[PDB]
């Protein structure tokens, strides 16, 4: 399948998951140090163990969208629609803090659902599908 | 809430929440005239079981109508609905309510059962709308 | 409504594997023509086929429904730019993906894949695909 | 024993939805005559009907079995004073209750309704009704 | 359906559940204060939170039977048969304390089973079906 | 236990408990002659699986017989049985035992699977009897 | 390979209850000849038979498959020295054991019996038996 | 139950849960706490986020503040509470509780036990229960 | 394990469960307690009620009385037990335990923690386990 | 069925479970006192309650094999093959300590699986099927 | 590991463990040439799902081959396989791998789904082999 | 969190879990403990047995030894730890823990509470967590 595809003035992205190394993002360790403090890493062992994977995965998904979108000539505010899949909606507050770092001005249109699982296995906690309006 | 991109309008998934802060959960949360319309029965056991979903569905569809009115269109300009359920057994109720808003020809439709929607498990139905309005 | 044109795009209702002439859910290799069975990967061994037949046959009906729906409107698989694909069991993905390759020889679509609980009309539907077409 | 008179009362065995001429469990609108389908609320839409058909058809077979059993003994639905009604899923109640209204136009019976785990012969039976008749 | 129906010398009642206001009885608060002390309310927060709903629901069901029966010209000792449905038989001791307040002399015939659910939803913990012998 | 109301006698639901204080749970809790009758097999695995329900069923039915004798009737005056099971898979065993007490024509019958009966989960079968004895 | 001789022993593949001429899983008394039904313990009562029929019929097909497989190689049930027997529900054991008695009138085999989760081709197979034969 | 009890230089609290001593209400979200305490627990103003984080934040705060007020009614301050035993229905809630606990121990935190149990009184909607021990000569 | 232990003015008990130190029996109902203690726990004489309430009442009593007897073997009385930690398999059992606890603290009750856990030693039939702390100069 | 059967130079045993008195072995109490210390009984109440049933059942199964095998003229080292069924593989360390008492020299060939249940009910934790090579 | 008894050789149940101390769990734990052979696809989602079982199956079968070589035979001397799965849905993958080791005529076969094998739940397949080698 | 804390003659430890203060690793089997400590926990050398017993033995040892080392950093020895509260995910693991605890209290064991809870920090792979109280004048 195609990372993104252009159709008229719209760009459709595939659903994107937190993978790089072939690994699945699973904690702060997987992300650049400046970003950690930016996601809210506290330095406390137990707090970072819990919040870390969701924060890291959410960042990785959102940054991959930003890169994929740019590599087609757009910026984050060209994204009209987000469809967001979770294994656990109680993770939403964590996702929402990260999404704030990518949409500081006008937020995209949003669909948010809890599903069972996504590819390639159950450790994926978040998948985002993006739609871009860029003539 | 909504956004224009060329001739299309895209809506956020709408959930049956009062914008009371509360989740709609029964005939009492909808105006008297419409209860009769959703198929309210009067009898207590029946309306206890059907009322949450009918009310929730109507709430969501009407929210969609109004948002589309406030953008220039009516319901027939809604061409694609993505519809999320906690329980597909509710679908017959939902399809009854939707036939109220599309009496002629329905839109393109997607229907899946998912686990939960925001903001909690009492929400039985979410609809995401796509409008074509040049 | 099974499809609707808006501008350059055509939108398809989500498609499930229904035997459109018996009103029942496709359930195995018996629901597909003999030479298509070889194509889907049928092996001839009772148990292998009992196990793969449902997802493979269901995947064929969905994708071939999409192909025919698009063919009839003048378009092609390469015009079907986007697929949203709902599974009851992601373990069926390799099977589904073997079939999807058959339908997209040159221009693969953009893809989203999730496991949900269930689809219409009941729990024996294993795969559902929502297709989006760009055809000026 | 499907029924037994004791004094003024007649007692019926609990009744399940069995196709009495094929020995199988009623499973949808196909098991009922076409004009009765409209009466039960069939809509013509594939998925709505797939979902309501079983409980509605099962409810019809049970209630119509009771009606016929009572008719044959000289009585009427108004003589069927008491019903005990067992469900696998109380969410089916609105459907069942739509059908029960059909059988009781003037004198509704006394009613008990519970969700139990299961009934004979297997888990596809959705509804079972025990009827009690007063007929001097 | 019919609250009760007369057939010869017998009166059949419908199964009765704890509803009034359209609410489902769910604690001591739903019952008259003299009755609370009578059901065994302790005044302790945690004890009353647990015992309360079952005690209150049981009383409400039994009193509705007493009223329905009287409104047909009988008293509690005219009830021959009780069929009693529970979501949880571990609630039986609570039910049994209340039933003692309605049958102090000779107890009716009894059938007692745990079922899954009753109408109109899962918060109903007790439903009683009564049969009356009253020529 | 039982009560007269006109020509009918009504019985409390009977459970398979010794009136030892204990729940009957196997062939050992029933007299030697009847074991052969319930279909006891001699082999250990089989009788371990069938014995609880056969014994329990027999215990309950016999309790019903005696209560009906102590009121003037025999089994044929029992016209309606309501029968509660923890597991309908047990029904075939139960139906075998019941055919012992109604060799000719069975009574009017209701059969459901419920969750539990008193006084705990080891009780597999409860029967409520209704007698017609003018 | 359904069987293989090595020296004096013949080894059988595990055997499941498949209707070998319709490719489907045996499911009740209807899958067995009428006089064999009496032998298996059919009672004529709808619900008793609905409940015992599957395990009894499945047990007959498995054991009779073994008998025929062994008969065709010159041997007998007394030559079938060892059985490994897999169940989905050990509560079916008394039924299975009633049928196994039929096949072993003089020299019963050595026996292992376990409850596992599942067998091929799907979850409706209730019983599977692996047989080992000593036939010089 | 005794709210607290002295024994030598020690004061032992009963395990505390987020219930109104008045209403008898279980604390269920932001609406049950002082307005500026909300943005102090990290409320965002977003409906869905606040619905998800509200209950654990509110209950934690309510419990921790109870401890404070109780400790006050015996002469001591938050910093004399040296031991906490903290019981959760769901340890995924820990980061939320930890945010709140920092607000009460800005300087040096107490000794700490944290376990996930099945349930606390009076029902399953109670997400956190803390037991406090005080050293106060 | 040490039944109890002194440390300054304090005596700490091991968590106690309803087992016979003799038989090795787990207490399972009324039949395991002194006859007049039965109607003192609220036995009704009804078979089914007593089967349902018997085990929690009997186990609670057995545990609480153990505490008493232990506390006695060190010179103290029930009223010097100032802290209890109480562990349940099922908090729906709380009203039963609370009835019993009143019988041991008729005057002023102790400091109290109550949680529902999954299991206690030696098996799942143990419904209640109490841990006691004593102040006794 | 047949406790064991001879076929050429091989002896097949039936799967064997811990039964005597018709009871199912369920603790140290069911086994001879010298053996208890030999299985690792500590004397501590809680330890013996947990380890006891698996240790006792494993011993009973293995000793019954030794007796059945001897009663056909062989010794434990005539057993070539063990097939071992468990309700819970976390019991394996306990089984393995006991098996060491029966195979001190060369261990038999081994198949080990967790199954759901065995005959006659769920309290059986171990069943062993043995195969003997004894011309 | 194995034992001779007359003309037969009996093998211990083999599990897919490296003798690294680790459980094999994906294509990466098998040599490049064989990945192509097991049906490795290159695409990431597919190979993530098929790779554990194919790798595990191949690991187990090859272990069997080598053990049989180190005793004088080849694969065709393996006449009976007992095959244990955590999930029978894996069987098609397993049957593909096994067809690699028995290209002509398969051996006598037993296939059940069990709960777990040693040493933990990540092991998806265990095979017990019986060899006939005079 | 404070590792330990003094209050009068008492020292209270935070509940301890089997994590490396260095790596941040959760202890998962024999490979995480000193080699001769393995056969001291009862390692057999068998692959399958050691895989099954390794994690509980290793985690118990790691936790108990932490307690020791901590107690040392305040001047006391294992025998001044008079109270332990021990939390398990699975009490079937108790015999393993008990073996290990004997190695630290060869003479007279401490006061003891043992319960099965659902989970401990930081995740579900933690099988045992012990809380220690010390008397040390
Ligand atoms: Ca949730
Ligand atoms: Ca469903
Ligand atoms: Ca069933
Ligand atoms: Ca219960
Ligand atoms: Ca399956
Ligand atoms: Ca509130
Ligand atoms: Ca609860
Ligand atoms: Ca006892
Ligand atoms: Ca347990
Ligand atoms: Ca396990
Ligand atoms: Ca490690
Ligand atoms: Ca967790």
Q: Give the DSSP per-residue string, B67-85.
A: HHHTTT--GGGEEEEEEEE
Residue J101 CA to residue K41 CA, distance in Å, equals 50
Query: What are the φ and ψ backbone dihedral angles of G118, each rounded to 5 degrees?
Result: -165, 155
From the list E23, E12, E18, E4, the residue with the least C-alpha distance to E85 is E18
H or E element, residue I100: helix I94-102
Residue H26 CA to residue H18 CA, distance in Å, equals 6
Q: Give the max Cα distance, chain C.
A: 49
> E-assigned strands of H1-137?
4-7, 10-13, 81-88, 111-116, 119-120, 128-135
Residue H98 CA to residue H117 CA, distance in Å, equals 18
* Inter-chain CB proximity A116 and C112 less than 8 Å: no
Chain F residues close to J22, C-beta within 8 Å? 44
Residue F25 CA to residue L81 CA, distance in Å, equals 50
Partner residue opposite I13 with nearest CB, options L94, L111, L133: L111
Measured in angstroms, how far is the CA atom of residue F21 from the centroid of ligand 8? 13
Gap sites in chain J (C to N > 2.5 Å), preceding residue numbers: 20
Residue B121 CA to residue B115 CA, distance in Å, equals 8
Assigned token pair, D104? 């009781």
A43: left (phi over 0), alpha (psi -120 to 50) or beta: left
H or E element, residue L7: strand L4-7
Residue B11 CA to residue A81 CA, distance in Å, equals 8
Assigned token pair, H29? 């979200």
**How far from E130 is each of A66, D135, E79, E118, E125, CA to CA, in Å?**
69, 21, 7, 16, 17
Residue H90 CA to residue H116 CA, distance in Å, equals 6
Chains that touch K (3 or more CB pairs under 8 A): A, C, G, J, L
| CATH superfamily entry for domain H1-137 | RutC-like (3.30.1330.40)
Counting DSSP H helices and E strands in chain J, the numbers are: 3, 6
Per-residue DSSP letter, D109 = P
Nearby residues of D72 by Cβ (< 8 Å), 6 or more positions away: none
Measured in angstroms, how far is the CA atom of residue B74 from the centroid of ligand 8? 74
Burial class of residue E67 (count of CB atoms within 10 Å of its CB; 0-12, 13-18, 19+):
exposed
Domain at B1-134, CATH class: alpha beta
Q: Is the CB of D82 inside 8 Å of chain F's CB atoms?
A: no
Per-residue DSSP letter, E45 = H
What residues form DSSP beta bridges with C87? C115, C127
Cα-trace Rg, chain E: 15
- Where helices occur in chain K by DSSP H, the ranges are 32-38, 44-69, 91-101
Sign of CA dihedral K89, K90, K93, K96: negative
Q: Taking the domains of chain J in order of start, what are their residue ranges?
A: 1-135
From the list K37, K90, K100, the residue with the least C-alpha distance to K64 is K100
Query: Tokens 């058809």 — which residue?
Result: D57
Residue A121 CA to residue A23 CA, distance in Å, equals 11
Residue F25 CA to residue A45 CA, distance in Å, equals 54
Q: Is the CB of L85 inside 8 Å of chain H's CB atoms?
A: yes
Do F and K have ≥3 inter-chain CB pairs under 8 A? no
What residues form DSSP beta bridges with A19? A24
Residue E134 CA to residue D86 CA, distance in Å, equals 28
Residue pair K13/K117 in contact by the 8 Å Cβ criterion: yes
Q: Is the CB of B121 inside 8 Å of chain E's CB atoms?
A: no
Q: E1-135 is classed in which CATH architecture?
A: 2-Layer Sandwich (3.30)
Q: Give the DSSP per-residue string, G71-110.
A: HTTT--GGGEEEEEEEES-GGGHHHHHHHHHHH-SS-PPE
Q: How far is F70 from chain E (nearest CA, A)?
A: 17
| 3-state secondary structure (DSSP) of residue A123 | coil
Residue E43 CA to residue D124 CA, distance in Å, equals 48
Strand order in the sheet with D3-6: D3-6, D9-12, D127-134, D80-87, D110-115, E117-118
Nearby residues of L119 by Cβ (< 8 Å), 6 or more positions away: H91, H115, H116, L89, L126
Residue E13 CA to residue E128 CA, distance in Å, equals 9
Residue pair E45/H122 in contact by the 8 Å Cβ criterion: yes
**How far from D32 is each of C122, D26, D60, H30, CA to CA, in Å?**
21, 9, 8, 55
Residue I116 CA to residue I86 CA, distance in Å, equals 9
Residue I126 CA to residue I120 CA, distance in Å, equals 6
Residue D51 CA to residue D44 CA, distance in Å, equals 12
Residue J79 CA to residue J107 CA, distance in Å, equals 9
The CA-based dihedral angle spanning residues F100, F103, F107, F109, taken in that order and rounded to the nearest 10 degrees: 50
Residue E97 CA to residue K121 CA, distance in Å, equals 50
Residue pair K127/K81 in contact by the 8 Å Cβ criterion: yes
Nearby residues of D56 by Cβ (< 8 Å), 6 or more positions away: D29, D40, D41, D42, D95, D98, D99
Residue J1 CA to residue J17 CA, distance in Å, equals 14
Assigned token pair, B1? 């809430």
Helix axes I94-102, E45-70, angle to 10 degrees: 110
Residue H125 CA to residue J79 CA, distance in Å, equals 58
What residues form DSSP beta bridges with D129? D15, D85
Chains that touch F (3 or more CB pairs under 8 A): D, E, G, I, J
Q: How many CB atoms lie within 10 A of CB H11?
A: 22
**How far from E99 is each of E37, E107, E133, CA to CA, in Å?**
15, 9, 19
Assigned token pair, A87? 């294994």
Resolution of the structure in the document, Å: 2.7
Residue pair I120/I129 in contact by the 8 Å Cβ criterion: yes
Nearby residues of H32 by Cβ (< 8 Å), 6 or more positions away: H20, H25, H58, H62
Residue L76 CA to residue L80 CA, distance in Å, equals 6
Gap sites in chain B (C to N > 2.5 Å), preceding residue numbers: 19
Burial class of residue L21 (count of CB atoms within 10 Å of its CB; 0-12, 13-18, 19+):
exposed
Nearest ligand atom owner, CA of L32: 11
Q: Is the CB of D44 inside 8 Å of chain C's CB atoms?
A: no
Partner residue opposite C11 with nearest CB, options B80, B106, B114: B80
Q: How many CB atoms lie within 10 A of CB C135?
A: 16
Q: Is the CB of L15 inside 8 Å of chain I's CB atoms?
A: no
Mutate to test the interface with G, among J3, J6, J11, J14 (most CBs of G within 10 A): J14
Q: Is the peptide bond before G122 cis (omega within 30 degrees of 0)?
A: no
Residue F119 CA to residue K18 CA, distance in Å, equals 54
Query: What are the φ and ψ backbone dihedral angles of C107, each rounded to 5 degrees?
Result: -115, 80
Residue A74 CA to residue A71 CA, distance in Å, equals 7
H or E element, residue G57: helix G46-71
For L86-105, b/e burial (b = at least 16 CB within 10 A) is: bbbbebbbbbbbbbbbeebb
Q: How many CB atoms lie within 10 A of CB B72?
A: 11
Query: Tokens 């709903």 — which residue?
Result: E53
Residue pair K52/K107 in contact by the 8 Å Cβ criterion: no
Assigned token pair, H63? 């419990």
Q: Is the CB of D128 inside 8 Å of chain F's CB atoms?
A: yes
**How far from G128 is each of G14, G89, K85, CA to CA, in Å?**
6, 12, 15
Nearby residues of I17 by Cβ (< 8 Å), 6 or more positions away: I63, I120, I121, I122, I126, I129
Residue I110 CA to residue I101 CA, distance in Å, equals 10
Residue B19 CA to residue B16 CA, distance in Å, equals 9
Residue D26 CA to residue D41 CA, distance in Å, equals 17
Residue H25 CA to residue H126 CA, distance in Å, equals 11
G7: left (phi over 0), alpha (psi -120 to 50) or beta: left
Residue C91 CA to residue A86 CA, distance in Å, equals 18
Residue pair B65/B126 in contact by the 8 Å Cβ criterion: no
Residue G123 CA to residue E100 CA, distance in Å, equals 50
Query: Tokens 């059969």 — which residue?
Result: F111
Assigned token pair, E69? 């029966």
Residue F115 CA to residue E114 CA, distance in Å, equals 5
Cα-trace Rg, chain D: 15
Query: What are the φ and ψ backbone dihedral angles of L8, each rounded to 5 degrees?
Result: 60, -135
Residues, chain E: 135
Query: What are the φ and ψ backbone dihedral angles of J128, each rounded to 5 degrees?
Result: -120, 130
- Where helices occur in K4-43 by DSSP H, the ranges are 32-38
Strand H10-13 relative to strand H111-116, pairing:
unpaired
| CATH, domain range G1-136 | 3.30.1330.40
Assigned token pair, F128? 């409520």
* Inter-chain CB proximity K45 and C93 less than 8 Å: yes
**How far from G101 is each of F49, G95, I42, CA to CA, in Å?**
17, 10, 55
Query: What are the φ and ψ backbone dihedral angles of C14, each rounded to 5 degrees?
Result: -55, 140
Helix axes B91-101, B44-69, angle to 10 degrees: 40
Chains that touch G (3 or more CB pairs under 8 A): C, D, F, J, K
Assigned token pair, D7? 């004094």
**How far from H104 is each of C89, H54, H98, CA to CA, in Å?**
47, 18, 10
From the list G66, G69, G135, the residue with the least C-alpha distance to G104 is G66
| 3-state secondary structure (DSSP) of residue E15 | coil
Residue B76 CA to residue B60 CA, distance in Å, equals 16
H or E element, residue I98: helix I94-102
Q: How many CB atoms lie within 10 A of CB D33?
A: 9
Residue D104 CA to residue D102 CA, distance in Å, equals 6
Q: Is the CB of F44 inside 8 Å of chain J's CB atoms?
A: yes
Measured in angstroms, how far is the CA atom of residue F50 from the centroid of ligand 5? 28
Three state DSSP letters for chain F: CEEEECCEEEECCECCECCCCCECCCHHHCCHHHHHHHCCCCCHHHHHHHHHHHHHHHHHHHHHHHHHHCCCCCHHHEEEEEEEECCHHHHHHHHHHHHHHCCCCCCEEEEEECCEECCCCCCCEEEEEEEECC
Chain C residues close to K43, C-beta within 8 Å? 97
H or E element, residue G51: helix G46-71
What residues form DSSP beta bridges with B85? B113, B125
Q: Is the CB of K36 inside 8 Å of chain C's CB atoms?
A: no
Q: Is the CB of G43 inside 8 Å of chain F's CB atoms?
A: yes
Residue E54 CA to residue E46 CA, distance in Å, equals 14
Residue pair G12/G69 in contact by the 8 Å Cβ criterion: yes
């Amino acid at each position: 399948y195609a990372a993104w595809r252009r159709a008229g003035d719209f760009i459709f992205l595939s659903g994107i998951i937190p993978v790089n190394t072939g690994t699945i993002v699973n904690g702060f360790q997987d992300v650049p140090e400046p970003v950690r403090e930016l996601l809210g890493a506290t330095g406390e062992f137990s707090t970072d163990a819990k919040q870390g994977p969701i924060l890291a995965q959410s960042w990785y998904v959102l940054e991959s969208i930003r890169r994929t979108v740019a590599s087609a000539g757009g910026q984050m505010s060209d994204v009209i629609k987000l469809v967001q899949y979770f294994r656990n909606l109680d993770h939403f507050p964590y996702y929402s803090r990260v999404r704030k770092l990518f949409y500081p001005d006008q937020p995209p249109v949003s669909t948010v659902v809890q599903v069972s699982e996504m590819l390639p296995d159950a450790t994926v906690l978040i998948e985002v599908e993006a739609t871009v309006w860029l003539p």
